[PDB]
Design a protein around this ligand. Structure first.
Ligand SMILES: OC[C@@H](O)[C@H](O)[C@@H](O)CO
Ligand SMILES: OC[C@@H](O)[C@H](O)[C@@H](O)CO
Ligand SMILES: OC[C@H](O)C(O)[C@@H](O)CO
Ligand SMILES: OC[C@H](O)C(O)[C@@H](O)CO
Ligand SMILES: [Al+3]
Ligand SMILES: [Al+3]
Ligand SMILES: [Al+3]
Ligand SMILES: [Al+3]
Ligand SMILES: [Al+3]
Ligand SMILES: [Al+3]
Ligand SMILES: [Al+3]
Ligand SMILES: [Al+3]
Lengths: 393, 393, 393, 393
């Protein structure tokens, strides 16, 4: 399997650009030149690149520095043909953000964080980005009494709605995508999971242009099922973007290569992305963005290898997912388990609650005993799924 | 601390009625008479009782049996003065529900589960219940390919948005409240957490009368912060009911006495329930319902002791929560940490995104370095919180 | 892949015999005749069968009942040719064991539990079993103050170091193997993991004949790495037996089909079992025992399918594990990562601590900077591993 | 409660010296002068201080720098009167240790790591330390195939035994204490828990002087019960040292103030440390060492406050633990639950397995039914425990 930009694979400048500094150690790799990264990724078959405002332009950059960086970067893009489908703001690294940006207890910091975002929205617009991601890594708490939970959600809404209103006023072809995370760095991050993110969006005045940007590792740190999460986001029509990576359990965020964490889950995630829902429905058209980090034990060759690995893993899983669903045995297995039967409405055409209630066959004279004897055969269906993933059947 | 019905403490018939049967053993206690339970609870200071349709009337009960049970039960209620603030349906114990009720792949089972619910709504109405809870214990899967995730959410919506319409047509003073859980008896249960529940509610046609019924142990099984969860539910004005209990980690549902799991979390949960939000806002008025199980190692005396314990724990935590907030030192500590400052809007009165952007003091000439030096003193605030909980002040 | 008794696959009578009763529901299947089970398993290609004393002979069985059961069972074994490599006692189902067997606070219960075990040792001897497993499911606590932790470990030692002495005195060709578990049905079970089990064994007087019987799902419920666990058990030469199954996260014991939980982990577990250690060392010769439960949603066909699935999964993973190591590219990748280099002793032949200390090249004049530049290429090695698992090479 | 050196509270130079740099951000505080730290801690009531070799002397320090640092430090110690009960080596921060020290696949790195340790042993000896801690943070893997698990345990044993042999040859009054940790930084760290540590110690040639140094947060990251862990370590007589801190769940290591994580667990941990075991047994005499980090949101005042908090928390919990056990009601509650009964040997004086087997009253004619009716009253005992912790009874 050889990737092409058609596949729409994208990488964050910070993924391959990660030098290795972690909680208990220093960087293990030298810095990666943004122009070099753009050229290497292009060479690898990537479709686009993403970045935080500060991945490209340093926090303390002067106008001449900002100008030369952007200049070089834009020339690199024009040469390679790489796209910039998504941009995001860094509201977590600088010490000023120690208590968050949008929900920092300090008001001047909140104003600064929002202004930083508004400016980044202009850059994204110039970059031609289609999605503006927001990952509130610092919005949370270690202690329960450090925040007025209601106020926090208000300040969060204020920032997001202000940003969204700005996009609307400027007429930018942009959409904001929130990225939930349970914990880390924060002990408890606000809007910890996909569901909390979706619900929050319903309280926004400009919710029409705000969606989600779920992450495999993020939902898994909460012990939840990622495929199920994105499925609900797709169902709600809020799956604006997606971050793919690997996580091996409820622990610190590993951000491994996609498919290097929960393999079977990864297989089913791609199945959903590529095949959509069995009884029909919407499909995700956005970019297949990888948000991982090359393990600090490896050198630059390993870095480029991990970039390839992400795309290979996806392409391999994809083949198996398509063959999986194409298998006639899988089709009959699906029928037997009632997969398509679930697609049938419970109530009959034009039937009301009262009608159902007074339908003896459905309740009073219903044989729940015989009904309970149905063999759903869910285990066999799963065995066929796994065999396809292994490349047996 | 001695509880009174004024406190509005309620218990499920199934809590104290649990005989001890678990996954690896049989029941360790005898059959708790529902009339005896009503009398004992009344005696203990409880305000009301709750139950699954089958806790009271057996699945295979004949009309004469149903009539004598309800008759005795109603007389018990009239004597004791106990209220029945909430009722719920049992869509998990009978083998027919092995693949769920509302989202069972089998259509006839879905119809039966819904009819069972519609009938239970009439009973709740007669019982004078105010809330109708729904815990989709069996709605989920062990394998990812067993369900069409979109269809499942459709069938789920159909059921609720079937039930809710019925309530409206009948003119019942009832509100549906969903009881989210990450997993068990299922591997992955649909709408695993508060957030997923809130978001789901936004896709309903009759969402105006559907809310949540969060549980301490349920959110904790996902490793999430319960206080934060209910806070978001309160903020969204969807906190219709609440199940209080104890959970000691991410494992099977222990359903311990409230305060017997995460103590500090429990303290802050009550703080929120009693004190509400620091900068003002809504407060929970519903019943303080305990949904636990007396450990199978204990006999009936232990059962009645655990019932008392729940109320004692709450009343003890309550005193400490009130004293906590009443402490002048805690007030100044809250000021220093910026708890009230968070209650201030980021933007100024009538200020726009553009104004903020072009405010040099807020961005261009902003001193993020000096700003970063603020000592939020979150640790000291937490120490004062804990000292109050310990009765040290 | 078609299994044969040569593979030495064994199943517990209770695995396929599980009727579906779980914490929140009743049994979904009928009574599996032990003779039928023996015949079906034989037919499936199983090498042997295992069982709890009560799986075969009921707790309240009379002599005539015991005699007819054993009689029929032995005839079934003689016909099929199935072996009984392992037997275990049921010290968890009966209400008398609500607070454990060996560590129950009640002394008469401890004596009864031990006597029950001593008798079961005679049966195992007659069955020709080689391993006597012990899963202290009820040995633990929900509350910290319920037990004197030192005394508990003493009573635990007394029981084993009572049983082991008995085996020795009788001259039985048996070895005890402990089945560690973090929790359930208990909140906290004594000797929660492989390590605690191994350490405990070192305090026993008859530790020479006591080992471990690790379980995939058990170690995973603690979030630990199973392959790493058995590796340490193998290293310590205490891997007497093994229970294989699937677990999808830190939650209740799912006991899924082997390979139906953490797929990549399963692959590496088999790799270790079949290939052993790269630089040489001991290998596990015992039976490949499956300790799972056919999901309650499925009927008897599903039951027999799950039995096949376990063996298929193992055989499929096995092929991929052998091919994995046989791959020349994998061999060079292993060399580059230093897999064999780790097999080299740190100190030189006859070198002492003092010599090392005063070796400038190793410390004083050591270039830790250049040394830090080594590309271990651990990511690429993992990619090759996964590609083999997927049947991509 | 006001702490004094009599209490034997110790802090690591790196605890209060932590500037705030974490995975997703930079340091938030200025550097703490080691001499200032020694003076402040003395002032606070601390008994001693601990440090990694590099906390005090930088990796790239020249002889003159090393000499002036140690000189100033020793004068500070002599002035304040602070002791240095424990010293440890830093085998995780420098990039050379990216794949571990003792178990690094690279042999020259293993030799360097061991030499670094041997030299640190001399320093500890000069510092008058009594315990030499070893926390193998980098010894592990992200991928299963990166290491030969047997070889890894061999290299680990080689380093520890070489170090221990050195101590013996030099005649140093030192004892090595291993510090297990599940994961982080490493995805999977070797000897992840107390049990694995204890078991490993039994394979060592110089195990007589090697013990454990458990950490609250470390065992909790594995979801295990800390009190139970140290209890087994005490029982095995391997509790050489202890690291106290707070952890709120299975996630990244928070290293909060002791008592700021799991409160009830903390209470029972101190209960064990202070009260020992109910039926008698050994007690921990070592230092009460705090290994935490002042939250990066706080300034230096917060730092000093957190130092006080640790000692206050312990002293507060201590009072409640003593009063708890002193309470006559608690004594009778303990009797009823059988806490002291567990201290009774199962077998009678001079009784054998055979005697027990043939004791009808203990098996054949044993009434397991009546026996099963005992009310252990474990819930009430826990309620009394919690009430003491809250300061009610
Ligand atoms: O976890 C079990 C659930 O909480 C139920 O008992 C609900 O209270 C109502 O169905
Ligand atoms: O988790 C349940 C345990 O694994 C048992 O079933 C053992 O196999 C033997 O008692
Ligand atoms: O700005 C958010 C980025 O996409 C990531 O670095 C986060 O997901 C970290 O988890
Ligand atoms: O050298 C080990 C120290 O005691 C700590 O910093 C570790 O526990 C980190 O978890
Ligand atoms: Al991301
Ligand atoms: Al991320
Ligand atoms: Al409930
Ligand atoms: Al519940
Ligand atoms: Al088992
Ligand atoms: Al098991
Ligand atoms: Al430490
Ligand atoms: Al630590």
């Amino acid at each position: 399997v050889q990737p092409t930009p058609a596949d729409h694979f994208t990488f964050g400048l910070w993924t391959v650009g990660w030098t290795g500094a972690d909680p208990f150690g220093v960087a293990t790799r030298k810095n990666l030149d943004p122009v070099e990264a753009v050229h290497k990724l292009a060479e690898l078959g990537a479709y686009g690149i993403t970045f935080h405002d500060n991945d490209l332009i340093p926090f303390d950059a002067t106008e001449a520095e900002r100008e030369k960086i952007l200049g070089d970067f834009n020339q690199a893009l024009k040469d390679t043909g790489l796209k910039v489908p998504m941009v995001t703001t860094n509201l977590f690294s600088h010490p000023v953000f120690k208590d968050g940006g949008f929900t920092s207890n300090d008001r001047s910091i909140r104003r600064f964080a929002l202004a930083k975002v508004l400016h980044n929205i202009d850059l994204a617009a110039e970059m031609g980005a289609e999605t503006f991601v927001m990952w509130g890594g610092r919005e949370g708490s270690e202690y329960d009494g450090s925040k007025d939970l209601a106020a926090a959600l208000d300040r969060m809404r204020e920032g997001v709605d202000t940003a969204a209103g700005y996009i609307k006023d400027k007429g930018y072809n942009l959409r904001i995508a929130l990225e939930p995370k349970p914990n880390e760095p924060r002990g408890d991050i606000f809007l910890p999971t996909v569901g909390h993110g979706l619900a929050f969006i319903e309280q926004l005045e400009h919710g029409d242009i705000v969606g989600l940007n779920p992450e495999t590792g993020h939902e898994q740190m909460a012990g939840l099922n990622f495929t199920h999460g994105i499925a609900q986001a797709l169902w709600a029509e809020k799956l604006f973007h997606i971050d793919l990576n690997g996580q091996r359990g409820i622990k610190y965020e590993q951000e491994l290569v996609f498919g290097h964490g929960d393999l079977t889950s990864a297989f089913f995630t791609v199945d959903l992305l590529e095949n959509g829902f069995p009884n029909g429905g919407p499909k995700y058209t956005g970019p297949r963005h990888f948000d991982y980090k090359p393990s600090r034990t490896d050198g630059y060759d390993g870095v480029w290898d991990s970039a390839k690995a992400n795309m290979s893993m996806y392409l391999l899983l994809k083949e198996r997912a398509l063959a999986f669903r194409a298998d006639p045995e899988v089709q009959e297995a699906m029928k037997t388990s009632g997969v398509f039967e679930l697609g049938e409405t419970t109530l009959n055409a034009g039937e009301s609650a009262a009608d159902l209630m007074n339908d003896s066959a459905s309740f009073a004279g219903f044989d729940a005993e015989a009904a309970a004897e149905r063999n759903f055969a869910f285990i066999r269906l799963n065995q066929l799924a796994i065999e396809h993933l292994l490349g047996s059947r």
